[PDB]
Design a protein around this ligand. Structure first.
Ligand code: MG
Ligand code: MG
Ligand code: MG
Ligand code: MG
Ligand code: MG
Ligand code: MG
Ligand code: MG
Ligand code: MG
Ligand code: MG
Ligand code: MG
Ligand code: MG
Ligand code: MG
Length: 180
RNA sequence: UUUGGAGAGUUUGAUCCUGGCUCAGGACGAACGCUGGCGGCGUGCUUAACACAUGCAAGUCGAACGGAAAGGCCCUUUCGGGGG
């Protein structure tokens, strides 16, 4: 079950002595909704070939987002190229809130509650590039604890560890129900 | 130890950056065009601190005093009125 979206379509032109040659391009976003995201950007002379190339590139490119239950861990300010994107965790039930491209990418990722805002470089390509850069910048609390070489409870707050406990309990319950 | 951030269009054969302009919401001590059944609730000179007809918007005490113009009572009557 792979989920796909299309953000924009642009008509590129090529000029020669004879006249004008045209081509099609598009960018696609693919995500499984369980923490998987991929960015694909393909070009072709027709929409079917373009979309096929884009989805193939998305299949080729893969990356795992370390989300905790429903929301992100810590605030992030990712800056890529001329695009800037900010992210912040939310209280449960608030819902997804962001611009077009940010909403598409985050939904394909599969989160439910998060804050976002775009401050420049409105174009979708740079927006998604900045968002994926921020996602790269995000880090896992277990990995940071291992790097620090200190006990987990001494680096993680009570709220976060409790939320992790409840998320693990719910995941175990869902797995048991599915197995049954 | 708790509460909460959305964008879109627009310069170029096609791309990006900065940056301008417009739109999606809420509010009025409001006005205008059209239409217009009823009940309940608030509100009604933001300009000329311009000029004003008119009728009202501050009186009360005889248990303070001198007194009885107009009333009541009792003495009188010619019904003009004479005393307390
Ligand atoms: Mg910068
Ligand atoms: Mg713009
Ligand atoms: Mg709030
Ligand atoms: Mg143009
Ligand atoms: Mg043009
Ligand atoms: Mg500037
Ligand atoms: Mg700008
Ligand atoms: Mg009418
Ligand atoms: Mg009634
Ligand atoms: Mg009224
Ligand atoms: Mg007067
Ligand atoms: Mg007085």
């Amino acid at each position: 079950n792979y989920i796909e979206r299309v953000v924009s379509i642009n008509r590129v032109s090529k000029v020669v002595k004879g006249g004008r040659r045209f081509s099609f391009t598009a960018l696609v976003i693919v995500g499984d909704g369980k923490g998987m995201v991929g960015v694909g950007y393909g070009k072709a002379k027709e929409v079917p070939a373009a979309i096929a190339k884009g989805v193939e590139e998305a299949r080729k490119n893969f990356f795992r987002v370390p989300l905790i239950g429903s929301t992100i861990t810590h605030p992030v300010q990712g800056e890529a190229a001329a695009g800037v994107v900010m992210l912040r965790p939310a209280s449960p039930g608030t819902g997804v809130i962001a611009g077009g491209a940010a909403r598409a990418v985050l939904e394909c990722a599969g989160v439910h509650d998060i804050l976002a805002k775009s401050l420049g470089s409105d174009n979708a390509i740079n927006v998604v590039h900045a968002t994926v850069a921020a996602l790269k910048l995000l880090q896992r609390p277990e990995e940071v604890a291992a790097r620090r070489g200190l006990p987990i409870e001494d680096v993680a707050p009570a709220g976060m560890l409790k939320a992790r406990r409840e998320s693990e309990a719910l995941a175990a319950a869902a797995a048991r129900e599915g197995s049954a």
